[PDB]
Design a protein around this ligand. Structure first.
Ligand SMILES: O=P([O-])(O)O[C@H]1O[C@H](COP(=O)(O)O)[C@@H](O)[C@H](O)[C@H]1O
Ligand SMILES: [Cl-]
Ligand SMILES: [Mg+2]
Ligand SMILES: [Mg+2]
Ligand SMILES: [Mg+2]
Ligand SMILES: [Mg+2]
Lengths: 242, 242
């Protein structure tokens, strides 16, 4: 039937931490005369503007910053969501409080600031604090590997919550993420599944387990295609759609 | 002997929350041919630039953002000190552990992120979180006066950290500052002290007890003058140097 193309932005339509190239933007616009297109990224709408231009809403059929928590369709905002409204202030506080209480009891060499980073689609938690220096990150990550600090504090959170529909995911060097079950890139799919697309292609570059694009790639609702770079995305699109 | 003028920024050289007027800027420079001048404010270096001009450091003999924890003299940065090194890493971790445990215990309509912001010469603490939106900021502000949330917090903090050489100051809407005794605006006198000034004049619009200019005004190293606006600062300086 009719189809949709969904692209990760960073690493797929663009080179890592680089803006789109006029040549690729033009290919995509030519491709829209053949098929509906849309983009999905973990970054806020401001960042996505930096990456694809301030006219992005008018140039793509769908735009899904924040893994879809914000959604634009045919130039209008289709929907907007945040972790606060979903989980609720009560539950959002029970979680903050426990995290705070628990971090007060961790004996560390150092503590700094921003232990809780509130993002609209997750809560970053950092025993040391994100404001640490790079040399303090390393000191902590090494200590974590011998004492397993992050792993035990997720463990105790998975016991006390998680029946509230919460996922916990250790990542990077100093923090872990608390986000509702399924609020990875798969979230965006809810805004396009009821629009009548017999097949939804998806292109991304972190397609293997761990990556930003893994969970959406493996979803049975997508025709998943891995990519290595923008040039490769044109290559594949040229072959799929002539 | 030779002398130095030190000016509070907001309200003394500028109308509150506004840039300086070109009239006032060019006056100061005419004075500078008669006297070394300097400025001091609580705000980070970038904010000072926005009030006095990008090239502040070249137009003022001394420049003291963050009450002087960051300091420029004749264009170049002076030796620096941070709260971690002064108070020690145990009192920092014991003061963070306490603040964290206490926030977890506060019942509030909303809690968000960045409850402790780790600055060069202080720690904010925001019961609600500095990442809060604007609507949430006013909410906490207008509830705080009904239930004296911050006022009550600062009080218990003083009891527990009595004698530890720390000061506390509720400022603004959502937070209070914790800083070593002596790290108000009078921190900067450490730099201009000596350097052969027989008289150090100081101007400030919040001379009254509890104001950010009080302790530097009363400090005996300074010849303090209370100001009611930029145009008044002129009157006193025109009375003194003409
Ligand atoms: O309002 P906030 O929470 O951002 O607070 C801000 O302003 C306060 C005073 O500002 P003023 O004297 O102009 O009211 C400062 O003490 C505080 O460190 C700063 O973060
Ligand atoms: Cl925090
Ligand atoms: Mg990518
Ligand atoms: Mg698939
Ligand atoms: Mg002032
Ligand atoms: Mg004095």
């Amino acid at each position: 039937g009719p189809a949709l193309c969904l692209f990760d932005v960073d690493g797929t339509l663009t080179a890592p931490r680089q803006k789109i190239t006029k040549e690729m933007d033009d290919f995509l616009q030519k491709l829209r005369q053949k098929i509906k297109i849309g983009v999905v990224g973990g970054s806020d709408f401001e960042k996505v503007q930096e990456q694809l231009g301030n006219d992005v809403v008018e140039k793509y059929d769908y735009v899904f910053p924040e893994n879809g928590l914000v959604a634009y369709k045919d130039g209008k905002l289709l929907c907007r969501q945040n972790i606060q409204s979903h989980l609720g202030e009560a539950l959002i506080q029970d979680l903050i409080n426990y995290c705070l209480s628990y971090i007060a009891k961790i004996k560390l060499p150092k503590k700094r600031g921003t232990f809780i980073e509130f993002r609209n689609g997750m809560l970053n938690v950092s025993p040391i604090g994100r404001s640490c220096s790079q040399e303090e990150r390393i000191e902590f990550y090494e200590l974590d590997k011998k004492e397993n600090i992050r792993q035990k504090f997720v463990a105790d959170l998975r016991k006390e919550f998680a029946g509230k529909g919460l996922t916990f995911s250790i990542g990077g060097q100093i923090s872990f993420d608390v986000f509702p079950d399924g609020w990875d890139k798969r979230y965006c799919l809810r805004h396009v599944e009821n629009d009548g697309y017999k097949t939804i292609y998806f292109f991304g570059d972190k397609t293997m387990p761990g990556g930003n694009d893994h969970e959406i790639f493996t979803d049975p609702r997508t025709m998943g295609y891995s990519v290595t770079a923008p040039e490769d995305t044109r290559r594949i699109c040229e072959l799929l759609f002539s």
